[PDB]
Amino acid sequence: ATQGVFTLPANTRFGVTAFANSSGTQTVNVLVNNETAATFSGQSTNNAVIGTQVLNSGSSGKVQVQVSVNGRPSDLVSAQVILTNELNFALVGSEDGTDNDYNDAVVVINWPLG
Ligand SMILES: *C(=O)C[C@@H]1O[C@@H](C)[C@@H](O)[C@@H](O)[C@@H]1O
Ligand SMILES: [Ca+2]
Ligand SMILES: [Ca+2]
Ligand SMILES: [Ca+2]
């Protein structure tokens, strides 16, 4: 199944933050309605924040997270969770190798903001 794709409410500001846990340099691209809106890159085996940014979901609300390492797409896992019918997390893990820890880049999207 497709992973890393989320439909947010339209025209909503959201946070996106990426952490790294891999010897490979992670590149995280965040697309809004299929256009790149943010790109983070970095390397850590200790959960360092490689980027954090506030974006806008636009008219469609479609947000996609893509992760690659040296140009090769990582395998993604994702889900969205809503607490008290208000607080939203869109969660992504990614795997660049064979150990299947799925933490090589971890991406968290949260809304609402403010
Ligand atoms: C390459 O070494 C594999 C890569 O980096 C490791 C340190 C570990 O985080 C592994 O999960 C990751 O796929
Ligand atoms: Ca891994
Ligand atoms: Ca890892
Ligand atoms: Ca508040």
**Nearest alpha carbon, ligand 1 atom 2:** 23
Q: Which residues contact 110 (CB under 8 A, 6 or more apart)?
A: 14, 15, 17, 87, 88, 89, 90
Look up residue 44 and give its DSSP letter: E
What technique solved it?
X-ray
Closest approach atom of ligand 1 to CA 23: 5
Distances (CA, A) of 96 to 8, 11, 38, 58, 91: 27, 32, 20, 30, 17
Cβ of 94 less than 6 Å from ligand 1: no
Joined tokens for residue 68: 């690659």
Look up residue 74 and give its DSSP letter: P
**Nearest alpha carbon, ligand 1 atom 9:** 22
Phi/psi at 87 (5° precision): -95, 125
- CATH code reported for the domain at 1-114: 2.60.120.400
* Contact yes or no for 7/64 (Cβ under 8 A): no
Alpha carbon distance 84, 43 (integer Å): 35
Alpha carbon distance 66, 7 (integer Å): 15
β-partners of residue 10 are none
Which resolution, in Å, applies to this structure? 1.2
